[PDB]
Structure 1
Amino acid sequence: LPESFDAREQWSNCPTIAQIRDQGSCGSCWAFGAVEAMSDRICIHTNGRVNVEVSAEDLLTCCGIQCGDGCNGGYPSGAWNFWTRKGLVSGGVYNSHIGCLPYTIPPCEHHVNGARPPCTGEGDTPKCNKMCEAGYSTSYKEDKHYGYTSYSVSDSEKEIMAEIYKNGPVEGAFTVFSDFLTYKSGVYKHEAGDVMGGHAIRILGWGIENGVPYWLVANSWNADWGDNGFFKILRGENHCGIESEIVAGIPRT
Structure 2
Amino acid sequence: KLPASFDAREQWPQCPTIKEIRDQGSCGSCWAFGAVEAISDRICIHTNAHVSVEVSAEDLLTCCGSMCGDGCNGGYPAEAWNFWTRKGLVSGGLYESHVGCRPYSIPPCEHHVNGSRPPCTGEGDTPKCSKICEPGYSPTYKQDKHYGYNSYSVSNSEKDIMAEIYKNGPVEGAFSVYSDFLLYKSGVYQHVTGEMMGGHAIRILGWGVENGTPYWLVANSWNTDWGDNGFFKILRGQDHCGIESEVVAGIPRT
- Give the TM-score normalised by the residue count of structure 1: 0.99
Residue 216 of structure 2: aligned partner: 215
Residue 103 of structure 1: aligned partner: 104
**AA of the residue aligned to 2:226:** W
Of 206-215 and 129-138, the range deviating more from structure 2: 129-138
**AA of the residue aligned to 1:64:** G
Residue 113 of structure 1: aligned partner: 114
| 2-structure distance, mates of 1:117, 1:148 | 39
| 2-structure distance, mates of 1:137, 1:78 | 27
Residue 38 of structure 1: aligned partner: 39
Return the offset for 1:29.
0.2
**What SS class does the counterpart of residue 182 from structure 1 fall into?**
coil
- Give the TM-score normalised by the residue count of structure 2: 0.99
**What SS class does the counterpart of residue 12 from structure 1 fall into?**
coil
Residue 11 of structure 2: aligned partner: 10
Residue 204 of structure 2: aligned partner: 203
| Residue 50 of structure 2 is aligned to residue 49 of structure 1 | yes
Residue 236 of structure 1: aligned partner: 237
Return the offset for 1:140.
0.6
Return the offset for 1:192.
1.3
| 2-structure distance, mates of 1:52, 1:67 | 23
Cα deviation, 1:27-80, whole Å, max 9, x if unaligned, reads: 000000000000000000000100110000000000011100000000001000
**AA of the residue aligned to 2:156:** D
**AA of the residue aligned to 1:74:** G
Return the offset for 1:228.
0.3
Residue 141 of structure 1: aligned partner: 142
**AA of the residue aligned to 1:164:** I
| Residue 63 of structure 2 is aligned to residue 67 of structure 1 | no
Residue 250 of structure 1: aligned partner: 251
Residue 187 of structure 1: aligned partner: 188
**What SS class does the counterpart of residue 204 from structure 2 fall into?**
strand
| 2-structure distance, mates of 1:129, 1:232 | 36
> Post-superposition, which runs of at least 4 consecutive aligned residues in structure 1 deviate over 6 A?
none
| 2-structure distance, mates of 1:138, 1:174 | 37
| 2-structure distance, mates of 1:5, 1:240 | 21
Return the offset for 1:178.
0.5
**AA of the residue aligned to 1:202:** R
* Equivalent residues, number: 253
For structure 2, the residue ranges without an aligned partner over 5 or more in a row are none
Cα deviation, 1:178-231, whole Å, max 9, x if unaligned, reads: 010000000000111111010000000000001100000000000000000000
**What SS class does the counterpart of residue 106 from structure 1 fall into?**
coil
Residue 161 of structure 2: aligned partner: 160
Cα deviation, 1:157-190, whole Å, max 9, x if unaligned, reads: 1100000000000000000100100000000001
| 2-structure distance, mates of 1:62, 1:128 | 5
Superposed CA RMSD: 0.5
| 2-structure distance, mates of 1:84, 1:121 | 31
Cα deviation, 1:105-150, whole Å, max 9, x if unaligned, reads: 0000000011210101001101111100111122110110000000
